[PDB]
């Protein structure tokens, strides 16, 4: 009999409850005070320009039909009760393929406060999409949006509101950072209106300002690129006389650069616009190709083949010495201009 009272309460709530109709349909607009608790910001799949985010999507809305006066002030019910009542058809405008976890049972808590202020949180693996303009990649701060609204209802039917202050609504757990390469600087919240063919939708944009950490690509791409360039410069130090060794150096360096360029592009999506990394690769490609062109010029003027011993020998190429100083310098100035332009 202890649990019979709550059974009679729930059966009284669901008695005559039409879950197809929204609260205040025809009378008032539905205020959905919704906030997010990011349990963990899943890895950003930059290849598909999408990011996974694991959230406790809390959303609350007063429902005058679910009024009760019982021993308990809040009915912490199971997820089965959730499908029995009207929940907003909230969908993520950029949600590509997401799933609400239901293992072991559905992960949606349904809390009914005695006044009818429903609180309906669910756990979600929102794989949302960011329109990314990776032009400054990897040094590219992204405002990855999380736009969510009601698929069916218009702004005249349901309007979405934040539970707390807009800054104090999208909370993120401190330990929940599954971002392998990115770094969540913070979240900027905004609410607006989007025009559609069927009508006007209210939209709750949430720009997760992700700053991509170059530490993965500094060693993945940038260090091998720079080391390949300084290999092509190690060429210059090596004597002009050794034609197979210098030529094999130049060829191996440019071949390396080719494999690095394709490896770099493989990680990112096949966007038209060249990334900042692509410019860095192109300049490095210019440097290695310039080094090989430089040795081809030296060989053009390399009158003698036999090398120094202990009978006139070759002279150290004026181009060799000039490139010995210029190329490191030119690279350094390029690198300083590069990092200053993109980091700042």
């Amino acid at each position: 009999d202890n649990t019979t009272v709550f059974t009679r309460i729930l059966d009284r709530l669901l008695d005559g409850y039409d879950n197809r109709l929204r609260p205040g349909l025809g009378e008032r607009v539905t205020e959905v005070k919704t906030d997010i608790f990011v349990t963990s910001f899943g890895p950003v799949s930059d290849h598909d320009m999408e990011y996974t985010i694991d959230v406790f999507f809390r959303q609350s809305w007063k429902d005058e039909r679910l009024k009760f006066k019982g021993p308990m002030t809040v009915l912490r019910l199971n997820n089965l009760m959730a499908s029995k009542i009207w929940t907003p058809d909230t969908f993520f405008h950029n949600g590509k393929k997401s799933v609400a976890h239901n293992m072991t049972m559905p992960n949606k808590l349904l809390r009914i406060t005695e006044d009818g202020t429903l609180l309906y949180t669910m756990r979600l693996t929102v794989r949302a999409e960011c329109p990314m303009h990776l032009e400054d990649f990897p040094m590219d701060a992204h405002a990855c949006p999380l736009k969510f609204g009601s698929y069916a209802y218009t702004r005249a039917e349901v309007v979405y509101e934040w539970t707390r202050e807009p800054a104090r609504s999208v909370v993120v757990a401190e330990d929940g950072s599954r971002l392998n390469q990115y770094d969540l600087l913070g979240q900027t919240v905004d609410s607006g209106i989007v025009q559609s063919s069927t009508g006007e939708y209210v939209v709750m944009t949430t720009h997760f300002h992700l700053k991509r950490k170059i530490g993965y690509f500094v060693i993945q791409t940038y260090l091998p690129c720079i080391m390949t360039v300084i290999l092509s410069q190690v060429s210059f130090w090596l004597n002009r006389e050794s034609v197979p060794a210098r030529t094999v150096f130049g060829v191996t360096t440019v071949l390396t650069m080719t494999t690095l360029s394709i490896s770099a592009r493989n990680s990112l999506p096949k966007v038209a616009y060249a990334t900042a990394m692509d410019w860095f690769i192109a300049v490095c490609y210019a440097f290695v190709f310039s080094a090989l062109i430089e040795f081809a010029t030296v060989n053009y003027f390399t009158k003698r083949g036999y090398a120094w011993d202990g009978k006139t020998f070759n002279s150290v190429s004026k181009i060799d010495r000039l490139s010995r100083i210029a190329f490191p310098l030119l690279f350094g100035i390029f690198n300083l201009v590069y990092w200053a332009t993109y980091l700042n």
Partner: antibody
Framework: EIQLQQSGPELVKPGTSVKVSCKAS????????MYWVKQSHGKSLEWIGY????????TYNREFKGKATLTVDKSSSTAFMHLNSLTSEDSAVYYCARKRNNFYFDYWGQGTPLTVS | YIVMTQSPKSMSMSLGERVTLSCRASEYVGSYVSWYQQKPEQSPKLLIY???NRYTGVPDRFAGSGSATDFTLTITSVQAEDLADYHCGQTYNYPTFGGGTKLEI
């Protein structure tokens, strides 16, 4: 047709405390949080603290923490503010606002002058 | 806390002239910036909500615009009644208002 009627002006001496009310009309008291705002004469508006009437939760300005206490009565629809340790710097006019959404403060109190001398 | 900085502290625009206000928050506030009219011995009255949208019953002369951190409230055809201090409020965080932009004929 929402009117936030306050207690009125008050004249006091330093050191004592003053309690100022805010009786909302029309919209249900529990539904919307009540924000308290201080208007120093010749100066801008300064927020003091908001009280969520339903569960009586409060949040206060850091500068106003301790000096201002927010208590809400729901049997009679009214939000009260207790101001303690009054000084010359606290002489100003106080309004009670209402937050309708995350955008705007819907309706404001008539105004409660407070004088300390 | 956020601080709202109304740039022109005082104005003396003539009646019917386009008079433009400018307000700037220190940090991001999104679209949650509101403009309020403070007539003397009167409580603030909402004039612009959500930066661009107009509150109900407001005359069309008050045109409000601007993106986050830079906002404008232009009275194209200002009359005698629409000449008083204006404060730009914000609610993206703990609310804070700005110094009144006073006017005089």
């Amino acid at each position: 047709e929402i009117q936030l009627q306050q207690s009125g002006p008050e004249l006091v001496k330093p050191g004592t405390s003053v309690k100022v009310s805010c009786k909302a009309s029309g919209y249900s008291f529990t539904d919307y949080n009540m924000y308290w705002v201080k208007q120093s004469h010749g100066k801008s508006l300064e927020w003091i603290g908001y009280i969520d009437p339903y569960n009586a939760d409060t949040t206060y300005n850091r500068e106003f923490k301790g000096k201002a206490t927010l208590t809400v009565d729901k049997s009679s629809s009214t939000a009260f503010m207790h101001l303690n340790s009054l000084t010359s710097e606290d002489s100003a006019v106080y309004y009670c606002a209402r937050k309708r959404n995350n955008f705007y403060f819907d309706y404001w109190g008539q105004g409660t002058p407070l004088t300390v001398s | 806390y956020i601080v709202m900085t109304q740039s022109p502290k005082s104005m003396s625009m003539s009646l019917g002239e386009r008079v433009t206000l400018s307000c700037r928050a220190s940090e991001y506030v999104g679209s949650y910036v509101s403009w309020y009219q403070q007539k003397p011995e009167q409580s603030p009255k909402l004039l612009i909500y959500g930066a661009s949208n107009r509150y109900t019953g407001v005359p069309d002369r008050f045109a409000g615009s601007g993106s986050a951190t830079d906002f404008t409230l232009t009275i194209t055809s200002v009359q005698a009644e629409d000449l008083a201090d204006y404060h730009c409020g914000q609610t993206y965080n703990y609310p804070t208002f700005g110094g009144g932009t006073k006017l005089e004929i």
